[PDB]
Design an enzyme around this catalytic site. Structure first.
Site, PDB file in Angstrom:
ATOM      1  N   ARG A   1       3.015 -13.567   0.686  1.00 44.14           N
ATOM      2  CA  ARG A   1       2.978 -12.245   1.294  1.00 44.14           C
ATOM      3  C   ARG A   1       2.114 -11.407   0.365  1.00 44.14           C
ATOM      4  NH1 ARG A   1       4.627  -9.259   5.181  1.00 44.14           N
ATOM      5  NH2 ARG A   1       5.838 -10.980   6.068  1.00 44.14           N
TER       6      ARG A   1
ATOM      7  N   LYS B   1       0.813  -1.216   0.000  1.00 42.60           N
ATOM      8  CA  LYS B   1       0.000   0.000   0.000  1.00 42.60           C
ATOM      9  C   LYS B   1       0.853   1.275   0.000  1.00 42.60           C
ATOM     10  CE  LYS B   1      -4.279  -2.097   1.579  1.00 42.60           C
ATOM     11  NZ  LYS B   1      -5.577  -1.806   2.249  1.00 42.60           N
TER      12      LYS B   1
ATOM     13  N   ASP C   1      12.270 -11.954   6.972  1.00 42.62           N
ATOM     14  CA  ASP C   1      11.324 -12.564   7.919  1.00 42.62           C
ATOM     15  C   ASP C   1      10.574 -13.703   7.279  1.00 42.62           C
ATOM     16  OD1 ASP C   1      11.989 -10.713   9.900  1.00 42.62           O
ATOM     17  OD2 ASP C   1      10.173  -9.450   9.629  1.00 42.62           O
TER      18      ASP C   1
ATOM     19  N   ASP D   1      10.428 -17.459   9.073  1.00 40.81           N
ATOM     20  CA  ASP D   1       9.238 -18.150   9.584  1.00 40.81           C
ATOM     21  C   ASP D   1       8.626 -19.133   8.588  1.00 40.81           C
ATOM     22  OD1 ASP D   1       7.749 -16.395   7.938  1.00 40.81           O
ATOM     23  OD2 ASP D   1       7.179 -15.090   9.629  1.00 40.81           O
TER      24      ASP D   1
ATOM     25  N   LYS E   1      10.035  -4.327  16.974  1.00 39.57           N
ATOM     26  CA  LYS E   1       9.818  -4.967  15.664  1.00 39.57           C
ATOM     27  C   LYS E   1       8.971  -4.153  14.659  1.00 39.57           C
ATOM     28  CE  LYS E   1       8.348  -9.268  13.398  1.00 39.57           C
ATOM     29  NZ  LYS E   1       8.245 -10.748  13.519  1.00 39.57           N
TER      30      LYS E   1
ATOM     31  N   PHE F   1      13.398  -5.215   2.810  1.00 34.34           N
ATOM     32  CA  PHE F   1      14.529  -5.997   3.318  1.00 34.34           C
ATOM     33  C   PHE F   1      14.101  -6.862   4.542  1.00 34.34           C
ATOM     34  CE2 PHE F   1      17.193  -4.565   7.100  1.00 34.34           C
ATOM     35  CZ  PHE F   1      17.981  -5.674   7.231  1.00 34.34           C
TER      36      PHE F   1
ATOM     37  N   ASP G   1      10.981 -11.636  19.282  1.00 40.44           N
ATOM     38  CA  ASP G   1       9.875 -12.405  18.713  1.00 40.44           C
ATOM     39  C   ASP G   1      10.255 -13.893  18.567  1.00 40.44           C
ATOM     40  OD1 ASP G   1       7.136 -12.136  17.840  1.00 40.44           O
ATOM     41  OD2 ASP G   1       7.789 -12.364  15.743  1.00 40.44           O
TER      42      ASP G   1
ATOM     43  N   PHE H   1      -1.902   0.021  16.430  1.00 45.81           N
ATOM     44  CA  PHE H   1      -1.915  -0.538  15.077  1.00 45.81           C
ATOM     45  C   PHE H   1      -1.716  -2.048  15.027  1.00 45.81           C
ATOM     46  CE2 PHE H   1       0.032  -1.511  10.871  1.00 45.81           C
ATOM     47  CZ  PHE H   1      -1.047  -1.162  10.083  1.00 45.81           C
TER      48      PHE H   1
ATOM     49  N   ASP I   1      -4.088  -5.086  14.094  1.00 47.06           N
ATOM     50  CA  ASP I   1      -3.648  -6.057  13.086  1.00 47.06           C
ATOM     51  C   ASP I   1      -3.910  -7.527  13.541  1.00 47.06           C
ATOM     52  OD1 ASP I   1      -2.390  -6.558  10.533  1.00 47.06           O
ATOM     53  OD2 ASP I   1      -0.553  -7.142  11.606  1.00 47.06           O
ATOM     54  N   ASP I   2      -3.626  -7.813  14.828  1.00 49.04           N
ATOM     55  CA  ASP I   2      -3.821  -9.103  15.478  1.00 49.04           C
ATOM     56  C   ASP I   2      -5.311  -9.414  15.649  1.00 49.04           C
ATOM     57  OD1 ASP I   2      -1.038  -9.152  15.704  1.00 49.04           O
ATOM     58  OD2 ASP I   2      -1.010  -8.924  17.888  1.00 49.04           O
TER      59      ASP I   2
END
Ligand SMILES: O=C(O)c1ccc2cc(-c3ccc[nH]3)cc(-c3cccc4ccccc34)c2n1
Ligand SMILES: O=C(O)c1ccc2cc(-c3ccc[nH]3)cc(-c3cccc4ccccc34)c2n1
Lengths: 343, 343
Positions: free
Chosen positions: A105, A50, A96, A100, A193, A91, A167, A232, A236-237
């Site tokens: 994405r 975005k 990431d 994980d 993070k 980056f 994390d 934020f 998001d969670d």
């Protein structure tokens, strides 16, 4: 909208960013093939989102600098610094996604998952990071804020990396331990993070470009921006599970991936020893049955109402923070961003 | 020896580097656990090598600065900058070991291969890189060469990364293509991936710390240092096969791993179409039989004599480069390094 309008000129400047970043291919044709690879890395990974963090730089620049001082060059520099924020994020995401074991994405295959890329994406993520400082030199070398911007991008990388470490230690892959999924740890992971690079960095870069280099003004702006950042990620969670992919464009993964989501955290502080056992048995499993059971335990513990009250209390507090820490900056720098974040 | 003596004080300063780098744990106990992980990353990855690149900074500093100006602080800064060179290398090695699927580095298990580390070493390598700029700020912030050192470390990272990209494109994993294993490509991979950070960076950092910031003096020093770097890697590729692990401490892996070694490169320019077929069939296989056949084809094409003549011609040329490009720097800055590199 200050964002919606400028988003076209912002994205149109990517063509110049790529041209300038792949320009050393002329004098050094020896490395031509590597420069060709860099171009594909930029084009795949810096495009598709975005662009709001990068856009925040451009929008805050226009609100912090006198229109009379906003010449062609000053504007080209603001768009370049905006793109540096987008390259910092590109980056961290490329890296990431590898760490994980992500598959996609924004609905597109992760760069590292592409045939022929694999673990080479580690060097690609490094090259994306090197591009920031190449751009800062190419456009801002002669500027009095040059060193301020370099140090800000370097400090933001380090804070994000510290966050990423926190994390990874909190949620080890192939490890079930909800004991370390505390609120104090959650706020710390979010602060380092996400909050610094997403909220503090864009405004801070705009501030230095405007000659606002004072330690107190930056600490004042930081107090507001990190609080916005904390809200934020909590949103998001929440939207990841109790939201809709029509508006968001993201479907629930937090449960199946054993993430330290704000939902599982508030479930921990408010649970009977029997309700804690149910969570332990279900959370982390890729079976649709077990994923369905987690969503149910949250609903019973009235977490959507816990978030609703959190959002009401959060918006109020951020308005109080703006009144108290905005001056001498025009409050509209913080308000324009708050409007986009809150609902 | 200027090196051998100073190597003890150099390594003794690592204790202070670690203490200072893990000091933000006091004011921010929230991130304590991440700081504990950083400490283990530093201790595993920055220690165990020969420290020669870091040492070059300290040795060149003493030969470029008047003894009268070399106070306690100036020396603490030189050792810190030396350790920044060692941290830059540690970040590239942790990452390269992941990318080429290595098992050991200097006979110790690769960090990423350690139980519980895995792909988390990607964030660890990033943290090692962030440590350079943290150290430069902590010790060199008030210095007039501060910005020069930041830009030099940033440019060296980018040049190494470009080199690494060139290497990965030249030798794809699970891909046999000796057509792209040319001399021109080999010199380019060596220049960017190794020569800049190993040879140019240490002297260049010492030069700026001495107030030698001229573009011509740096270009002059660069002309000598990259040539030394080109020789060094060619010697590294030769000793890997035609050397002995008693003196070196490394056993032949280049063949089994399909690397773009200088040996396979000179074999390409000097081969009958039948000798090229033999190489294609053997090079890249983990069978001891096939590895033995490659070593034989090199010996027949008189490559040890081709290297011997290369070393004779190389040493002569580097003495000619020192005469021509050392001034105004004391030739002993280049000579002390050349002595350590050549045999
Ligand atoms: O990658 C992006 O640019 C992106 C993707 C999804 C997003 C979702 C929301 C959003 C969710 C619910 C209400 N609002 C807000 C922003 C956002 C907008 C404006 C500025 C920003 C600055 C930093 C971070 C985010 C933003 C957003 N940005
Ligand atoms: O990791 C290290 O510090 C390391 C490991 C193995 C080495 C082997 C030789 C060597 C092989 C044959 C003759 N000499 C030379 C140096 C070296 C010595 C002094 C300064 C340097 C500066 C940059 C790079 C290397 C060096 C060396 N350095």
């Amino acid at each position: 909208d200050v964002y919606a309008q400028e988003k076209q000129d912002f994205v149109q400047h990517f063509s110049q960013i790529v041209r300038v970043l792949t320009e050393d291919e002329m004098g050094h044709p020896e490395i031509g093939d590597a420069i060709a690879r860099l171009k594909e890395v930029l084009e795949y990974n810096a495009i598709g989102g975005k662009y709001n963090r990068g856009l925040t730089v451009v929008v805050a620049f226009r609100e912090l600098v006198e229109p009379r001082k906003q010449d062609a060059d000053s504007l080209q520099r603001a768009w370049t610094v905006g793109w540096c924020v987008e390259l910092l994020q590109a980056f961290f995401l490329v890296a990431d996604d590898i760490m994980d074991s992500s598959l996609t994405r924004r609905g597109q295959i992760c760069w590292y998952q592409k045939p022929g890329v694999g673990l080479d994406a580690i060097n690609d993520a490094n090259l994306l990071e090197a591009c920031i400082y190449r751009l800062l030199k190419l456009y801002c070398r002669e500027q009095p804020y040059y060193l301020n911007l370099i140090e800000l991008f370097l400090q933001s990388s380090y804070q994000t990396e510290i966050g990423q470490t926190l994390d990874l230690l909190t949620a080890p892959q192939g490890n079930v331990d909800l004991v370390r999924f505390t609120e104090k740890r959650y706020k710390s992971i979010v602060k380092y993070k996400t909050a610094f690079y997403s909220f503090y960095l864009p405004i801070a870069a705009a501030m230095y470009m405007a000659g606002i280099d004072g330690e107190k003004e930056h600490a004042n702006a930081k107090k507001i921006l990190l609080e916005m950042g904390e809200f934020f990620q909590i949103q998001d969670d929440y939207l990841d599970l109790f939201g809709d992919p029509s508006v968001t464009g993201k479907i629930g993964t937090d449960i199946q991936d054993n993430k330290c989501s704000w939902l599982v955290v508030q479930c921990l502080q408010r649970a009977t020893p029997e309700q804690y056992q149910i969570l332990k048995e279900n959370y982390g499993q890729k079976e649709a049955e077990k994923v369905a059971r987690v969503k149910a335990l949250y609903e019973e513990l009235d977490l959507p109402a816990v978030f609703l009250q959190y959002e009401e209390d959060s918006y109020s507090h951020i308005m109080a923070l703006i009144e108290q820490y905005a001056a001498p900056l025009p409050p509209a720098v913080f308000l324009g961003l708050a409007r986009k974040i809150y609902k």
